[PDB]
């Protein structure tokens, strides 16, 4: 005689998203936690606002699907509005059976299920809008993993003065983004290999930037051996690019989600 | 504004499930 069973159906990955649905999450499981197997007031005036904000959400959510061209989002968002949509009709509908009778046990369960909707539904809503964010972050890196290759074409010293002013700011934004991400991550492993990585990239910047200038002035003189100077360059790049990918790959790990191919 | 309106309904909902019990 072996028995084991409980509830299910609630995902979560981002630190913020959790500290937003976590409460309503434990509340639901705690309301069903009474697994031993009391009347209900009038939830008419407190379920109408949950339907209110829920509407505003779909609103600001349906507009975001009209701006950001993130296709994978423009197609992953809609189904969400559907979830919260009907998940609400139950909440509002459930509140009725309880108003017409606040002792009904199917309603208490019916009510929870509907709430479990707006939660599970809003979850995807944020989750999706989030993966899209981790995306914009990848784009930034992809563009920083594309410019470095441009170093291998900087001959004139004057250009070096237009490569840094450019590469710099890029790495700057490519740093703040990573900083925030690590905070949002819910796994120690990722947070680490993600930070220490973006770390070397910062140090390797003032380096390749030198090998670039050291070469731009060495070729200007009879100083033969640009190899030991040039090689040092591309070598640094190759190191940065190899590191930058660890970031991307890591992010994509925390990115590619079920809804995705 | 998403993370906002979301948190909004999150509470607005958390305020409803509160009338479902309090021990």
Do A31 and B17 lie within an 8 Å CB cutoff? yes
Q: Which of A184, A188, A202, A98 is nearest to A137 (CA)?
A: A184
* Three-state DSSP state, A259: coil
Residues of A within an 8 Å Cβ radius of B: 16-17, 20-21, 23-24, 27-28, 31, 38, 40-41, 43, 46-47, 49-50, 52-54, 56-57, 59-61, 64, 91, 108, 111-112, 115, 118-119, 122, 125-126, 129
How many domains, in total, are found in chain A?
Answer: 2
Do B13 and A31 lie within an 8 Å CB cutoff? Answer: no
Angle between helices A105-151 and B2-14 (to 10 degrees): 160
Last-in-domain residue among A132, A148, A172 = A132
Token reading at A13: 């990955």
Inter-CA distances, A187 with A4, A142, A177, A192, Å: 28, 24, 17, 9
How far the first Cα of chain B sits from its last, in Å, is 35
A2 plus A127 within the same structural domain: yes
Q: Tell me the C-alpha to C-alpha distance, in Å, between residue A95 and each of A28, A39, A116, A241, B12.
A: 16, 13, 14, 57, 15
Which value, in Å, is the radius of gyration of the alpha carbons in chain B?
Answer: 11
Residues A157 and A94 in one domain: no
- Could you tell me if A187 and A118 lie in one domain? no
Find where tokens 């819910």 sit.
A186
Resolution of the experimental model, in Å, one decimal? 4.0
Residue of B nearest to A24 (CA): B14
What experiment produced this structure? X-ray
Q: How far apart, in whole angstroms, are the C-alpha atoms of residue A139 and residue A150?
A: 17
d(C-alpha B14, C-alpha B7), whole Å: 10
Domain hosting A11: range is 1-132
**Which H helix or E strand runs over A173?**
helix A157-184
């Amino acid at each position: 005689m072996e028995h084991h069973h409980h509830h299910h159906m609630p995902v979560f990955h981002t630190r913020t998203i959790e500290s937003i649905l976590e409460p309503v999450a434990q509340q639901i499981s705690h309301l069903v936690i009474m697994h031993e197997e009391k009347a209900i007031p009038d939830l008419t005036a407190p379920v109408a606002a949950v339907q209110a904000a829920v509407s505003n959400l779909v609103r600001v959510g349906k507009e975001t699907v009209q701006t950001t061209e993130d296709q994978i989002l423009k197609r992953d968002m809609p189904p969400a509005f559907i979830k919260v949509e009907n998940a609400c009709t139950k909440l509002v509908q459930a509140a009725q059976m309880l108003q017409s009778d606040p002792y009904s046990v199917p309603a208490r369960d019916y009510l929870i299920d509907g709430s479990r909707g707006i939660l599970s539904g809003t979850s995807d809503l944020l989750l999706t809008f989030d993966e899209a964010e981790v995306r914009k972050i990848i784009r930034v890196c992809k563009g920083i993993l594309e410019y470095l290759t441009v170093a291998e074409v900087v001959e004139t010293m004057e250009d070096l003065v237009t490569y840094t002013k450019n590469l710099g700011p890029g790495m700057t934004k490519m740093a703040k983004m990573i900083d925030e991400r690590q905070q949002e991550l819910t796994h120690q492993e990722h947070r680490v290999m993600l930070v220490n990585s973006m770390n070397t990239v910062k140090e390797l910047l003032p380096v390749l930037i030198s090998a670039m200038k050291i070469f731009v002035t060495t070729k200007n003189s009879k100083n033969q051996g640009i190899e030991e100077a040039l090689k040092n360059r591309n070598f640094t790049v190759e190191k940065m690019s190899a590191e930058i990918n660890e970031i991307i790959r890591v992010l994509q790990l925390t990115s590619w989600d079920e809804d995705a191919w | 504004a998403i993370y906002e309106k979301a948190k909004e309904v999150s509470s607005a909902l958390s305020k409803v499930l509160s009338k479902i019990d309090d021990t």
